[PDB]
Enzyme design. Structure first.
Site, mmCIF file in Angstrom:
data_model
loop_
_atom_site.group_PDB
_atom_site.id
_atom_site.type_symbol
_atom_site.label_atom_id
_atom_site.label_comp_id
_atom_site.label_asym_id
_atom_site.label_seq_id
_atom_site.Cartn_x
_atom_site.Cartn_y
_atom_site.Cartn_z
ATOM 1 N N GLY A 10 -7.570 -24.460 -42.886
ATOM 2 C CA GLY A 10 -6.783 -23.232 -42.810
ATOM 3 C C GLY A 10 -5.821 -23.296 -41.647
ATOM 4 O O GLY A 10 -5.392 -24.386 -41.251
ATOM 5 N N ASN A 11 -5.473 -22.127 -41.110
ATOM 6 C CA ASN A 11 -4.796 -22.042 -39.817
ATOM 7 C C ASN A 11 -5.753 -22.479 -38.713
ATOM 8 O O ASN A 11 -6.969 -22.256 -38.803
ATOM 9 C CB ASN A 11 -4.296 -20.622 -39.544
ATOM 10 N N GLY A 18 -7.757 -24.810 -37.779
ATOM 11 C CA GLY A 18 -8.697 -25.921 -38.002
ATOM 12 C C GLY A 18 -9.067 -26.421 -39.397
ATOM 13 O O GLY A 18 -8.632 -25.884 -40.426
ATOM 14 N N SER A 19 -9.864 -27.489 -39.404
ATOM 15 C CA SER A 19 -10.431 -28.067 -40.610
ATOM 16 C C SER A 19 -11.845 -28.534 -40.296
ATOM 17 O O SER A 19 -12.204 -28.741 -39.129
ATOM 18 C CB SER A 19 -9.572 -29.224 -41.153
ATOM 19 N N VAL A 20 -12.656 -28.646 -41.341
ATOM 20 C CA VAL A 20 -13.997 -29.185 -41.236
ATOM 21 C C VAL A 20 -14.110 -30.335 -42.233
ATOM 22 O O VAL A 20 -13.692 -30.195 -43.389
ATOM 23 C CB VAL A 20 -15.075 -28.115 -41.489
ATOM 24 N N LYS A 68 -15.854 -30.255 -37.069
ATOM 25 C CA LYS A 68 -14.754 -29.296 -37.003
ATOM 26 C C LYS A 68 -13.730 -29.731 -35.965
ATOM 27 O O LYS A 68 -14.081 -30.048 -34.826
ATOM 28 C CB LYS A 68 -15.252 -27.881 -36.681
ATOM 29 N N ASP A 97 -15.307 -12.087 -38.313
ATOM 30 C CA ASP A 97 -14.835 -12.826 -39.491
ATOM 31 C C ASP A 97 -15.915 -13.010 -40.567
ATOM 32 O O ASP A 97 -15.853 -13.943 -41.368
ATOM 33 C CB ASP A 97 -14.290 -14.185 -39.036
HETATM 34 C C1 LIG Z 1 -12.935 -22.434 -40.647
HETATM 35 C C2 LIG Z 1 -11.946 -23.263 -41.478
HETATM 36 C C3 LIG Z 1 -10.538 -22.690 -41.295
HETATM 37 C C4 LIG Z 1 -12.008 -24.684 -40.932
HETATM 38 N N1 LIG Z 1 -12.313 -23.325 -42.924
HETATM 39 S S1 LIG Z 1 -13.444 -22.419 -43.810
HETATM 40 O O1 LIG Z 1 -13.689 -21.074 -43.329
HETATM 41 O O2 LIG Z 1 -13.137 -22.614 -45.212
HETATM 42 C C5 LIG Z 1 -14.878 -23.401 -43.415
HETATM 43 C C6 LIG Z 1 -15.817 -22.876 -42.525
HETATM 44 C C7 LIG Z 1 -16.948 -23.632 -42.197
HETATM 45 C C8 LIG Z 1 -17.130 -24.917 -42.746
HETATM 46 C C9 LIG Z 1 -18.357 -25.654 -42.429
HETATM 47 C C10 LIG Z 1 -18.925 -25.722 -41.136
HETATM 48 C C11 LIG Z 1 -20.134 -26.403 -40.903
HETATM 49 C C12 LIG Z 1 -20.743 -27.007 -42.014
HETATM 50 N N2 LIG Z 1 -21.909 -27.727 -42.134
HETATM 51 N N3 LIG Z 1 -22.179 -28.124 -43.390
HETATM 52 C C13 LIG Z 1 -21.163 -27.656 -44.121
HETATM 53 N N4 LIG Z 1 -21.090 -27.775 -45.463
HETATM 54 C C14 LIG Z 1 -20.232 -26.948 -43.313
HETATM 55 C C15 LIG Z 1 -19.017 -26.260 -43.521
HETATM 56 C C16 LIG Z 1 -16.175 -25.420 -43.665
HETATM 57 C C17 LIG Z 1 -15.036 -24.673 -43.984
#
Ligand SMILES: CC(C)(C)NS(=O)(=O)c1ccc(-c2ccc3[nH]nc(N)c3c2)cc1
EC number: 2.7.10.2
Length: 293
Positions: free
Chosen positions: A20-21, A23-25, A44, A138
Site C-alpha cells: 500500500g502506501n 509499506g509492503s509485507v 515488513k 486501523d
Molecule cells: C500494511 C500493508 C500496507 C503492508 N499491507 S496490508 O494491510 O494489506 C498487510 C498487513 C499485514 C500483513 C502481514 C503481516 C505479518 C504477517 N505474518 N504472516 C502473514 N501472512 C502476515 C501478513 C500483510 C499485508
C-alpha cells in the site's frame, strides 16, 4: 548469535503478502545455509523510507516488540541496512493469510460459531493492546491474520499510537491516508483517537465479519450509498459526518443474530463514553458463544 538480528542477504523472496502506501509485507525464507531449509517469515519494509517514515517505522517496531499476546502477531526481529539505516521488521508467518481474504474465500462455510471465536480473539488482542495505552487506529479485517482454523491475530500496527501520559486521546495534526469508513465521528471531526474510537472500529469489523466481505455490502459501498455516490473528495467526509450525527449507520447484515447486531450498534454510539469496553465485549461474546454451544 542473537536470533532477533536478521542478515538481509540471507532473506529469500518467496511471495508478496500485501502492499500500500508507505509499506509492503513479503513472505521470505531466512536461509543462511542457502539450501532452502531455513524458516519462512513475514518481512515488513517501507516503499518510501524518508527520515519521517523511518522514524515512525522504528516506533511501530518497538510497539510490536512490546506486545506478547496469543492474538497479536509475533515479533521475530529486525534488519538494519548499512549507511542510511533502512529497517525491516521480521514477524512470524501466519500461513492462512488475512481474515478479509479468508472470509471472502470461504464465506458462509465459516459458521457463526467460528465468526464469534474470531470476534472474541480480536476483542482480546485489542483489550490487551489497550492495557499498554496503545491506540490501533486501523482495525479492519484486512489487518487481521489467520494462523489456523481456530486462531486469528491482529497483524499490523502501522497506525498505532501511544497515548500521552495525561490524556485519554491522541490528536493527529496532519492526517495522512485515513480509513474514514471505519472512523468514529470524533475522529472525522476533530482527529481524536482513543480506546473508544478503536471500539467504534471494532463494531465495523464485526459488521465486516457478518457480511462475509460481500463487496456490495462493504462499509465504503454502504456509506457511499447513504451519502450519495455523487459525493467526492472532501465532500465525502462532510456528508459522512452529517450522516453519523443523524444516526445514519451501516444496516444489519443479512442473517446476523440479533445479539450480535446489538453489539455493533452499541459500539457505534455518538456518545464516546457510552461505548462498551473491550473487557466487557470479550465477556459478552464468550457468553454468547457459550449459549450457542
Ligand atoms: C500494511 C500493508 C500496507 C503492508 N499491507 S496490508 O494491510 O494489506 C498487510 C498487513 C499485514 C500483513 C502481514 C503481516 C505479518 C504477517 N505474518 N504472516 C502473514 N501472512 C502476515 C501478513 C500483510 C499485508
Amino acid at each position: 548469535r542473537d536470533p532477533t538480528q536478521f542478515e538481509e542477504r540471507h532473506l529469500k523472496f518467496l511471495q508478496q503478502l500485501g502492499k500500500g502506501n508507505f509499506g509492503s509485507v513479503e513472505m521470505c525464507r531466512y536461509d543462511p545455509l542457502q539450501d532452502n531449509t531455513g524458516e519462512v517469515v513475514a518481512v515488513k519494509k517501507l516503499q518510501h523510507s524518508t527520515e519521517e517514515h523511518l522514524r515512525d517505522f522504528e516506533r511501530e517496531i518497538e510497539i510490536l516488540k512490546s506486545l506478547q499476546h496469543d492474538n497479536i502477531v509475533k515479533y521475530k526481529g529486525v534488519c538494519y541496512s548499512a549507511g542510511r539505516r533502512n529497517l525491516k521488521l521480521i514477524m512470524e508467518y501466519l500461513p492462512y493469510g488475512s481474515l478479509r481474504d479468508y472470509l471472502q474465500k470461504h464465506k458462509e462455510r465459516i459458521d457463526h460459531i467460528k465468526l464469534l471465536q474470531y470476534t472474541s480473539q480480536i476483542c482480546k488482542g485489542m483489550e490487551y493492546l489497550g492495557t499498554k495505552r496503545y491506540i490501533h487506529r486501523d482495525l479492519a479485517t484486512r489487518n487481521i491474520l489467520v494462523e489456523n482454523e481456530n486462531r486469528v491475530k491482529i497483524g499490523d500496527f502501522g497506525l498505532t499510537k501511544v497515548l500521552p501520559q495525561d490524556k485519554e486521546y491522541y490528536k493527529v495534526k496532519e492526517p495522512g491516508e485515513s480509513p474514514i469508513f471505519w472512523y468514529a465521528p470524533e475522529s472525522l471531526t476533530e482527529s481524536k483517537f482513543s480506546v473508544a474510537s478503536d471500539v467504534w472500529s471494532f463494531g465495523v469489523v464485526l459488521y465486516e465479519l457478518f457480511t462475509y466481505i460481500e463487496k456490495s455490502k462493504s462499509p465504503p459501498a454502504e456509506f457511499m450509498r447513504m451519502i450519495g455516490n455523487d459525493k467526492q473528495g472532501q465532500m465525502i467526509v462532510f456528508h459522512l459526518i452529517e450522516l453519523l450525527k443523524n444516526n445514519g449507520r451501516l444496516p444489519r447484515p443479512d442473517g446476523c443474530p440479533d445479539e450480535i447486531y446489538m453489539i455493533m450498534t452499541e459500539c457505534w454510539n455518538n456518545n464516546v463514553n457510552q461505548r462498551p469496553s473491550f473487557r466487557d465485549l470479550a465477556l459478552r461474546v464468550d457468553q454468547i458463544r457459550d449459549n450457542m454451544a
